[PDB]
């Protein structure tokens, strides 16, 4: 009661710190509760550019991966390239013979994952035909040309003999062979180029085969051409053999691509590539990977935070903040 503390007493008070400006977090108990400090767990900002300092980034520029593989002339710079990540641009275009690839997406995936365009020519012998067919749809310089990796065969004299060739795989890796069939625009064109009215391509290994027939008919002109080539592929394992048998329309392989089991990929993005430090790439550019989550893009490559829908998640790093007064 005495206003002055007796000398034979003391007061001891227990307490905790507080800060003037706390921050709000969510718990199991409370929609919002103020804590002394919190940290952001969601990366929502990108670097606006793709960093090329950790992973080997290859800019496709005007070329798709497939066109670089086939050897579209404007893609010649890409011969024998390799990558961790191949960047495909929305403005890429094809500029050779018009073509399609049944299951295009699978071939793109296989090559992208392999991470290389290491190509090796092989000594195929094509008895009794003319090799190195070319087209005005595909200029290399100012000269009619063709996909560098394919060999467009046509008749010699008045005949196109049944082609029958073999190529054993005596290496220790998978060989990828790319080949095709030409689809003429008319019966007249078919017999003109290949003699046989009904073309056929059979590509086989010991335990698999692909049997293809040409498709004949008028189609919309693309670079002056109503004809088309359809592209196919065949993987030959070590100890297996490749066989090609055709009585017309064959667009022959010139060799093989080396297939690797890689950590490579392909990504669609229009963002510039520059010098900087990042271990995670998205179509929006590289991002920091300090945080466990990100809301930048579900498409990622590298050492990346997990994509989630939320744009912010605040983790408390301090106690409940209870300011004075």
């Amino acid at each position: 009661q005495n206003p002055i503390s007796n000398n034979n007493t003391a007061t001891l008070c227990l307490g905790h710190h507080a800060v003037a400006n706390g921050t709000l977090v969510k718990t199991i108990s409370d929609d919002q509760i103020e804590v002394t400090n919190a940290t952001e767990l969601v990366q929502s900002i990108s670097m606006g550019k793709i960093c090329n300092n950790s992973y080997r980034i290859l800019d496709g520029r005007n070329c798709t991966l497939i066109d670089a593989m086939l050897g579209d002339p404007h893609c010649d710079v890409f011969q024998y390239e390799n990558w961790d990540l191949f960047i495909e641009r929305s403005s890429a275009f094809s500029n050779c013979y018009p073509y399609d690839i049944p299951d295009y997406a699978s071939l793109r995936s296989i090559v992208a994952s392999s991470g290389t365009l290491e190509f090796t020519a092989e000594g195929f012998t094509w008895t009794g035909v003319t090799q190195n067919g070319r087209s005005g749809a595909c200029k290399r310089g100012s000269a009619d040309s063709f996909f560098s990796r394919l060999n467009w065969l046509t008749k010699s004299g008045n005949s196109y003999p049944t082609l029958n060739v073999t190529m054993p795989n005596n290496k220790n890796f998978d060989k990828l062979y790319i080949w095709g069939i030409h689809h003429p625009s008319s019966n007249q064109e078919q017999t003109k180029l290949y003699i046989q009215e009904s073309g056929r391509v059979t590509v086989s290994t010991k335990r698999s085969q692909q049997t293809i027939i040409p498709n004949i008919g008028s189609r919309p002109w693309v670079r002056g051409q109503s004809g088309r080539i359809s592209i196919y592929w065949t993987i030959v394992k070590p100890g297996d053999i490749l066989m090609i048998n055709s009585n017309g329309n064959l667009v022959a392989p010139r060799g093989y691509f080396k297939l690797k089991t890689g950590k490579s990929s392909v990504m669609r993005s229009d963002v510039p590539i520059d010098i900087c430090v990042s271990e995670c790439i998205t179509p929006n550019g590289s991002i920091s990977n300090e945080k466990p989550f990100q809301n930048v893009n579900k498409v990622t490559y590298g050492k990346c935070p997990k994509y989630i829908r939320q744009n912010t998640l605040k983790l408390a790093t301090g106690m409940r903040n209870v300011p004075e007064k």
């Binding site: 503390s5 000398n7 034979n8 007493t9 003391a10 007061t11 001891l12 008070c13 227990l14 307490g15 905790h16 710190h17 507080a18 800060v19 003037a20 977090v25 969510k26 718990t27 199991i28 108990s29 804590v35 767990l41 997406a105 995936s109 992208a112 994952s113 890689g262 950590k263 490579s264 990929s265 669609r268 990977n289 466990p292 989550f293 579900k298 498409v299 990622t300 490559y301 590298g302 050492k303 990346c304 935070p305 997990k306 994509y307 989630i308 829908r309 939320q310 998640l313 605040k314 983790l315 408390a316 790093t317 301090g318 106690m319 409940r320 903040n321 209870v322 300011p323 004075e324 007064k325």
Partner: protein, 172 residues
């Protein structure tokens, strides 16, 4: 919070305590003072710091995956690709929401616990020599200079030497 110390029987925090999370203020014949408690502070910090590392694996490299954007309609295979990705995202988004709420709850509860534990530790040292005033304050019923306060703070307070004096002050 569940112990009722922080935002509870302790009315508010001290913005003037910058060298610790928990501590003491005292008043005796030598004046008033303040001192941080390092052990309670460290215990809380150790539990809180990088706490997610206990449940979230070190981020690893992922490489080629599935396509997640499509420029043409295709039907069945594309429907499945999109559904798989949507499913994955929804499950990880839920995991993230739950983890943060659980961790935050745990953080609030463990810091409230440290406050209560420091209070109980002090109470036990003092035995019959002090009373709980409320507000997290003790009235100590004997002469208790800065060295004596110091013995409470470092856990070496000997209640026995002050008991006779304290009991007489408390009860007479």
């Amino acid at each position: 919070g569940i112990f009722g110390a922080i935002a509870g029987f302790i009315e508010n925090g001290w913005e003037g305590m910058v060298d610790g999370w928990y501590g003491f203020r005292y008043q005796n014949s030598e004046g008033t003072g303040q001192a941080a408690d390092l052990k309670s502070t460290q215990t809380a910090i150790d539990q809180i710091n990088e706490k997610l590392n206990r449940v979230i694996e070190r981020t690893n490299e992922k490489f080629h995956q599935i396509e997640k954007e499509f420029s043409e309609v295709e039907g069945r295979i594309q429907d499945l690709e999109k559904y798989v990705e949507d499913t994955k995202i929804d499950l990880w988004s839920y995991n993230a929401e739950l983890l943060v709420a659980l961790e935050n709850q745990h953080t609030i509860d463990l810091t409230d616990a440290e406050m209560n534990k420091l209070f109980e530790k002090t109470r036990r040292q003092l035995r019959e020599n002090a009373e709980d005033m409320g507000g997290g304050c003790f009235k100590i019923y004997h002469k208790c200079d800065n060295a004596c306060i110091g013995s409470i703070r470092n856990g070496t307070y000997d209640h026995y030497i002050y008991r006779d004096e304290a009991l007489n002050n408390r009860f007479q």
